[PDB]
Amino acid sequence: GPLGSRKIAQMTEEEQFALALKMSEQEAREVNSQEEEEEELLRKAIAESLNSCRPSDASATRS
Numbered sequence: 001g002p003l004g005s006r007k008i009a010q011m012t013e014e015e016q017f018a019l020a021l022k023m024s025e026q027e028a029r030e031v032n033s034q035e036e037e038e039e040e041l042l043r044k045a046i047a048e049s050l051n052s053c054r055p056s057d058a059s060a061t062r063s
Contacts, residue, residue, distance in 0.1 A: 001007055011019070
């Protein structure tokens with residue numbers, strides 16, 4: 001193969017089962033932590049939104 005690498009030998013029955021378990025673990029680890037953080041930010045965003053009150057100046061003059 002490439003770089004003269006040796007081809008991969010056939011996998012045993014036990015190895016195949018091991019791969020199945022490994023794939024399952026990878027699927028769980030594929031979970032993005034940002035999802036949990038995003039949810040927390042959303043909850044905080046709501047409170048900030050209520051405290052984001054910023055009425056336009058009556059004079060129309062910028063601070």
